[PDB]
């Protein structure tokens, strides 16, 4: 191998005492190699050679070796010196030409290396935030070099949640196999229970988070029957015959076509109001919204109640940005003008709904619930529209005229404290909204008899 | 009874030694500073707290607000920056046999995030090699594999984007003993045909540049690359690679056609590359200007400039997309004009106007747009000369150019009137 071999020698005998030890002296063991030999050779390999980028100290229970080959030891722990590049710099330090790894020989590494990815990726989303980083070829190459950072950060994610006849006689035994069958039995029951409820009226986190829901949860039970005991299990009674509980818990568990359910409903939530505060986020919410909601082709009920849960939360938005946009004491016009983008977010549902309807009559030619939800997203849209009229006739009013202006006035602070009734209480606002329909109605002919004036 | 809430520092006084101490225990530099309370409560969670088998000791030295002895319990640790981190109880091994099980690993100071990554990946199919797993793993093994795989190829792909493409030969799988793994390799050999047509000339233009050096430095990038491609695509073509295409074959055909087809696009390329050279000379005896005279110049040596493309087409001949590269031709003559135009006014010509007392500038400033007028004159003469296939279409093309000549001559006309005043 290099002359500075020195440097590597006391960063040896100072390191490999507390990895391979609890502090004092590590019996000398690097000597030992260089005199048989192959430990001399390999470690001047390591230190010099271009090719062979890597060393690995390996500590065996007490015994040391010294060699690039890498033996899982238990109960060992280890330090592992790489050189990478060829000839060692004698001229200088060789704690800054090697990087030094201690490695736990047969112990949890599956959460050390987790750690370490994790650690990995906190420090290259700071450079992220930091200047350039990546580098290399910049601008599309870093961007490509932040997509392979957010997938490493998503492996470390993935790895924290991750964190026949050798019985004999004993085989075949009524209460062995009884309870075997009987457990089985009750795992079908506890499958079951995740494998029905109506959908009702739900917000938009709830739908997309009880399907991921159902994505991460029947995926764990997938990871728990693929595990080769629990299979095992149903081995032995198929060995025993006792064939109810294998053929129940290969049919009966609905996990097969519930898993696909759980993996739409997760491709659904991946693909996708309630925090919009703006009449132009509002549209822009239901803009996204309606175009997440086209990957239809690829249960027919199943895709209607995620549509259902998109719309609802629509819905929310506009009446948010609306508000934002003292009714009565603000001028018509003025209130016409915000009133003119809520309405135009409100001609749009109008169109989706016509699009969704065209879409079930197809789908009634076919074959000789989502009627419902299709009403109600017709009765969404019908109530959406209501609010916009409103907004116009007080624009309407400001445009014409110190009379005209009056009339305005009068009509938004009607608004105004229908709107504060709905804002109350969430169950208000539906009982509160079909009583503030026949008091508008009212309230409207007054209003058109001082304008004709 | 080892060490606590000093175990760890006693053991990492002798085991980080800098290759020559072995010092044992307790560091006194740490216990001297005394920084910091917030470093003082999360070390003394780290000692007796459970729970947590993490400590970072970060030495980073010198470059910018360096964390040195950082270092804190997970947390962060930015950049030069040499520090480690222990194992400790790992949900809680402590109040009895200390921390046994720590895990201790050394971290130097100095993508190498990406390599790092790349290593966990090849840790993690050595362990799926080795046994099994206790059901943890389960059957997700293979697929956290696959997962890791997939990592690794957007990793090459990152590396080629900041690097030179290569994503193919990353996307080949390594040491295979499965189909879908070759699959996977496959798809992303199409991404790296897909990013040679998606880059283009006309891409650049429409983003302001187009000068006359930068675009046949463009052309001379886009050849290197499709020649680095064509030797990638070689070491892509693995005898293993094709027996992979023949057990299913339509999407090994598309890429195989895609390749044949930047082979071929890469010869024009080469064609149009060593265009490019001779439009780089050009730009040189542009690029190299310090913006004083040159137009006096420039006009007269505007015409032999226009002479030599003209020459340029038929020496190449199956030169691809020459109605193309035209546009990018007109495009490099109107931007070096545009820089030169704004170095004889700008700032200059406002301090002139404002003073009122310079003239011969104004008679100047006419000057530079004669420049641009020879340089239309020539383009013209060019087309004579050329016979035919005139193509240039600078009555759009040439709008831009146009479009500063006139409002360059509408200050003429009004600095001309200023002085009669």
Redesign the interface.
């Known amino acids: 191998k290099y002359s500075k071999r020195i440097?590597?020698?006391?960063?040896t005998?100072?390191?490999s005492?507390?990895?391979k030890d609890?502090?004092?002296?590590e019996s000398f063991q690097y000597e030992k190699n260089k005199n048989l030999l192959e430990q001399f050779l390999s470690g001047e390999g390591l230190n010099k050679i271009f090719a062979y980028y890597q060393v690995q100290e390996q500590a065996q229970n007490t015994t040391g070796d010294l060699e690039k080959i890498?033996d899982?030891a238990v109960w060992f722990?280890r330090?592992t010196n790489p050189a990478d590049d060829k000839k060692k710099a004698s001229q200088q330090?060789?704690?800054?030409n090697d990087?030094?790894?201690?490695?736990?020989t047969p112990?949890?590494?599956?959460?050390?290396?987790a750690?370490?990815?994790s650690?990995?990726?906190?420090?290259?989303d700071?450079?992220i935030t930091e200047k350039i980083?990546?580098?290399?070829?910049?601008?599309?190459?870093?961007?490509?070099?932040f997509?392979?950072?957010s997938?490493?950060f998503s492996?470390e994610v993935?790895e924290a949640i991750?964190l026949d006849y050798e019985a004999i006689s004993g085989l075949s035994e009524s209460e062995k196999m009884q309870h075997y069958e009987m457990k089985f039995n009750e795992w079908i029951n506890l499958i079951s229970s995740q494998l029905r409820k109506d959908e009702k009226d739900a917000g938009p986190a709830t739908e997309l988070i009880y399907w991921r829901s159902r994505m991460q949860k029947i995926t764990n039970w997938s990871?728990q029957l693929?595990?080769?005991?629990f299979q095992i299990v149903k081995a032995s009674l198929q060995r025993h015959k006792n064939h109810d509980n294998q053929r129940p818990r290969g049919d009966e568990s609905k996990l097969n076509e519930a898993k696909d359910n759980v993996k739409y409903l997760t491709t659904l939530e991946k693909f996708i109001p309630l925090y919009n505060g703006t009449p132009q986020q509002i549209i822009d919410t239901l803009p996204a919204l309606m175009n997440a909601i086209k990957m239809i082709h690829t249960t027919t009920d199943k895709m209607t109640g995620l549509f259902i849960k998109i719309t609802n939360q629509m819905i929310k938005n506009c009446k948010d940005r609306i508000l934002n946009k003292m009714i009565w004491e603000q001028d018509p016009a003025e209130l016409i003008e915000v009133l003119g983008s809520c309405i135009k977010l409100y001609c749009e549902y109008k169109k989706c709904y016509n699009d969704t309807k065209e879409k079930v009559a197809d789908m009634p030619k076919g074959k000789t619930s989502d009627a419902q939800i299709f009403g109600k997203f017709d009765t969404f849209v019908r109530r959406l529209q209501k609010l916009i009229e409103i907004f116009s006739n007080i624009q309407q009013f400001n445009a014409l005229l110190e009379g005209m202006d009056v009339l305005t006035n009068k009509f938004k602070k009607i608004i105004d404290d229908f709107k504060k009734k709905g804002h109350n209480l969430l169950d208000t606002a539906n009982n509160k909204f079909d009583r503030d329909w026949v008091e508008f109605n009212v309230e409207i002919s007054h209003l058109d008899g001082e304008l004709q004036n | 009874m080892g060490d606590h809430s000093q175990k760890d520092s006693p053991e990492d006084f002798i085991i980080n030694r800098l290759s020559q101490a072995l010092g044992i225990q307790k560091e006194k530099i740490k216990k001297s500073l005394e920084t910091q309370q917030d470093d003082k409560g999360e070390v003394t969670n780290k000692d007796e707290f459970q729970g947590f088998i993490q400590q970072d000791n970060s030495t980073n030295i010198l470059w910018v607000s360096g964390q040195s002895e950082k270092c804190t319990f997970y947390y962060g640790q930015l950049p030069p920056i040499d520090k480690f981190k222990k194992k400790g109880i790992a949900i809680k091994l402590g109040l009895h046999k200390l921390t046994n099980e720590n895990v201790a690993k050394d971290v130097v100071v100095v993508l190498l995030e990406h390599l790092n990554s790349v290593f966990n990946e090849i840790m993690s199919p050595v362990m799926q090699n080795p046994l099994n797993q206790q059901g943890w793993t389960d059957l997700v093994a293979k697929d956290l594999m696959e997962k890791f795989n997939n990592y690794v190829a957007q990793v090459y792909v990152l590396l080629g984007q900041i690097k030179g493409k290569t994503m193919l030969p990353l996307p080949s799988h390594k040491l295979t003993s499965k189909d879908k793994a070759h699959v996977f390799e496959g798809s992303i050999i199409t991404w790296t045909k897909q990013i040679k047509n998606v880059l283009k000339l006309e891409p650049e233009q429409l983003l302001k540049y187009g000068n006359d050096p930068g675009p046949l430095a463009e052309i001379e990038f886009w050849q290197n690359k499709r020649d680095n491609l064509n030797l990638i695509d070689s070491q892509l073509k693995s005898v293993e690679v094709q027996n992979i295409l023949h057990f299913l074959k339509s999407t090994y055909t598309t890429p195989f056609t895609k390749l044949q087809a930047e082979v071929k696009k890469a010869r024009l390329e080469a064609n149009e590359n060593y265009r490019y050279l001779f439009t780089l000379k050009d730009l040189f005896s542009k690029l190299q200007e310090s913006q004083p005279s040159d137009f006096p110049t420039l006009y007269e040596l505007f015409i032999p400039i226009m002479h030599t493309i003209l020459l340029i087409y038929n020496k190449s001949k199956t030169y691809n997309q020459p109605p193309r590269l035209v546009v990018l031709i007109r495009e490099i003559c109107n931007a070096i004009i545009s820089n030169a135009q704004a170095f004889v006014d700008k700032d200059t010509i406002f301090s002139l106007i404002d003073s009122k007392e310079t003239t011969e500038a104004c008679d100047k400033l006419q000057v530079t747009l004669d420049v641009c007028s020879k340089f239309k004159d020539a383009y013209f003469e060019y087309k004579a000369k050329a016979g035919g296939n005139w193509k240039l279409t600078s009555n759009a093309l040439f709008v831009r150019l146009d479009s500063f000549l006139e409002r360059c001559q509408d200050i003429l006309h009004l600095t001309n009137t200023i002085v009669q005043f």
């Open positions: 440097a590597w020698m006391k960063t005998i100072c390191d005492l507390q990895l609890m502090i004092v002296e890498q899982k722990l330090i330090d060789g704690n800054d990087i030094i790894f201690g490695e736990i112990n949890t590494v599956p959460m050390l290396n750690l370490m990815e650690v990995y990726s906190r420090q290259i700071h450079i980083q990546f580098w290399g070829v910049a601008e599309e190459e870093q961007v490509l070099e997509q392979q950072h997938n490493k492996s993935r991750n990871e693929k595990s080769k005991d």
